[PDB]
């Protein structure tokens, strides 16, 4: 879909009013299935490792998040369609320049390709960026063609601050999701009983990310 209109007339107002925005049928069936094949190839060839946390304490990571992940830049062989997804994500964000709150978005993370391998795995309630690490927008693409959340679970439940309802996001095939990464949107991945895939990038606010980098580089 043309990025300019999608960004300015839907994503921007959705995000400013609600902090959450769902765009269904983002890339179409053919591209979505190609991304699925690339993700399944990453899985099959042993690329995924246990998802990690910002700060590590005495606890096992698997008591917090049960997924296995790899990071993708988009130019690797066999990841070209994931790269197209990332470019489309970036195109929307660039068309939102200066319209998403007061943020100045200048960069992002690599893509995290994540799998909850059924078996009841999930992610306890958490905030993506609680202490100012620079992340302002979480962007997730789901690619689960036959997912029936009523049986397989895996719903992303977001608890947007100040709202009278929470937001249940089924991990639907070809669904794109945006939400503010900060404390306004605590969220949990409810237990998954089938293999569940999602691809996330986090967009950085320039000033906050610069401060977080200064903190890291000074110890």
């Amino acid at each position: 879909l043309p990025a300019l209109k999608l960004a300015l007339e839907y994503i921007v107002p959705c995000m400013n009013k609600h902090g959450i925005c769902v765009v269904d049928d983002f890339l179409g069936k053919e591209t979505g299935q190609q991304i699925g094949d690339e993700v399944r190839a990453l899985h099959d060839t042993g690329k995924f490792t246990d998802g990690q946390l910002v700060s590590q304490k005495s606890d096992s990571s698997k008591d917090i998040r049960g997924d296995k992940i790899t990071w993708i830049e988009g130019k690797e062989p066999g990841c070209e369609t994931i790269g197209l997804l990332m470019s489309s994500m970036d195109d929307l964000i660039r068309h939102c320049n200066g319209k998403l709150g007061s943020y100045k978005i200048n960069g992002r993370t690599k893509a995290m390709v994540a799998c909850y391998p059924g078996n009841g795995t999930g992610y306890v309630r958490h905030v993506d960026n609680p202490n100012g690490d620079g992340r302002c927008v979480t962007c997730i693409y789901y690619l689960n063609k036959d997912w029936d959340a009523k049986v397989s679970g895996g719903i992303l439940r977001i608890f947007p601050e100040g709202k009278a309802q929470f937001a249940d996001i089924e991990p639907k095939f070809d669904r794109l999701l945006f939400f503010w990464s900060d404390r306004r949107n605590p969220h949990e991945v409810q237990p998954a009983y089938a293999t569940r895939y999602a691809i996330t990038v986090w967009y950085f606010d320039a000033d906050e990310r610069a401060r977080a980098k200064v903190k890291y580089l000074t110890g």
Binding site: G51, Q52, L53, V54, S55, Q56, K57, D59, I64, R65, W71, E73, D90, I93, R94, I105, N106, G107, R108, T109, K110, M112, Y123, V124, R125, H126, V127, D128, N129, P130, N131, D133, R135, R183, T200, W202, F204, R209, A212, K213, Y216
Partner: peptide
């Protein structure tokens, strides 16, 4: 209260980030 960073999904702080 709990340190919410112990629950937040890791991202690399080193290297660069992707520049748009």
């Amino acid at each position: 209260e709990l340190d919410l960073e112990t629950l937040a999904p890791y991202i690399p702080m080193d290297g660069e980030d992707f520049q748009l």
